[PDB]
């Protein structure tokens, strides 16, 4: 685990793309957490694309982690793979 921040890094119900193959695909955020025996890998994230290009219903070896997910548009991958489009607050 870690310390400092509390909760998912990627904004929920937001718009973010995903690096698939040799191209990116815009999508929406819904799930952002780790997986059993895959905590060291990082933090998986399920993005709900607008087009039918998903591949994750929201399960792991039988167990269900994401209910909102669906094997049609949603896509669980590494956050680093996701490509958001926000700047956030400023200050200088």
Curated annotation (Swiss-Prot):
Disorder named in the UniProt entry: Cylindromatosis, familial: A disorder characterized by multiple skin tumors that develop from skin appendages, such as hair follicles and sweat glands. Affected individuals typically develop large numbers of tumors called cylindromas that arise predominantly in hairy parts of the body with approximately 90% on the head and neck. In severely affected individuals, cylindromas may combine into a confluent mass which may ulcerate or become infected (turban tumor syndrome).
Q: Which source organism does the UniProt entry give? A: Homo sapiens
Q: Which family does it belong to?
A: Belongs to the peptidase C19 family.
Q: What does this protein do?
A: Deubiquitinase that specifically cleaves 'Lys-63'- and linear 'Met-1'-linked polyubiquitin chains and is involved in NF-kappa-B activation and TNF-alpha-induced necroptosis. Negatively regulates NF-kappa-B activation by deubiquitinating upstream signaling factors. Contributes to the regulation of cell survival, proliferation and differentiation via its effects on NF-kappa-B activation. Negative regulator of Wnt signaling. Inhibits HDAC6 and thereby promotes acetylation of alpha-tubulin and stabilization of microtubules.
On assembly, the entry states:
Interacts (via CAP-Gly domain) with IKBKG/NEMO (via proline-rich C-terminal region). Interacts with TRAF2 and TRIP. Interacts with PLK1, DVL1, DVL3, MAVS, TBK1, IKKE and RIGI. Interacts (via CAP-Gly domain) with microtubules. Interacts with HDAC6 and BCL3. Interacts with MAP3K7. Identified in a complex with TRAF6 and SQSTM1. Interacts with OPTN and SQSTM1. Interacts with CEP350. Interacts with RNF31; the interaction is indirect and is mediated via SPATA2.
UniProt's post-translational modification comment states: Ubiquitinated. Polyubiquitinated in hepatocytes treated with palmitic acid. Ubiquitination is mediated by E3 ligase TRIM47 and leads to proteasomal degradation.
Q: Where is the CAP-Gly domain?
A: 33-66
- Hey, what tissues is this thing expressed in? Detected in fetal brain, testis, and skeletal muscle, and at a lower level in adult brain, leukocytes, liver, heart, kidney, spleen, ovary and lung. Isoform 2 is found in all tissues except kidney.
Protein name from the UniProt record: Ubiquitin carboxyl-terminal hydrolase CYLD
What subcellular locations does the record give?
Answer: Cytoplasm; Cytoplasm, Perinuclear region; Cytoplasm, Cytoskeleton; Cell membrane
């Amino acid at each position: 685990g870690s310390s400092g921040s509390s909760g998912p890094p990627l904004e929920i119900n937001s718009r973010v793309s995903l690096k698939v193959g040799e191209t990116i695909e815009s999508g929406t955020v819904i799930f952002c957490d780790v997986l059993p025996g895959k905590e060291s890998l990082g933090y998986f994230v399920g993005v709900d694309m607008d087009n039918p290009i998903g591949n994750w219903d929201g399960r792991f070896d039988g167990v269900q982690l994401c209910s909102f997910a669906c094997v049609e548009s949603t896509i669980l991958l590494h956050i680093n793979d996701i490509i958001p489009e926000s700047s956030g607050p400023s200050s200088g």
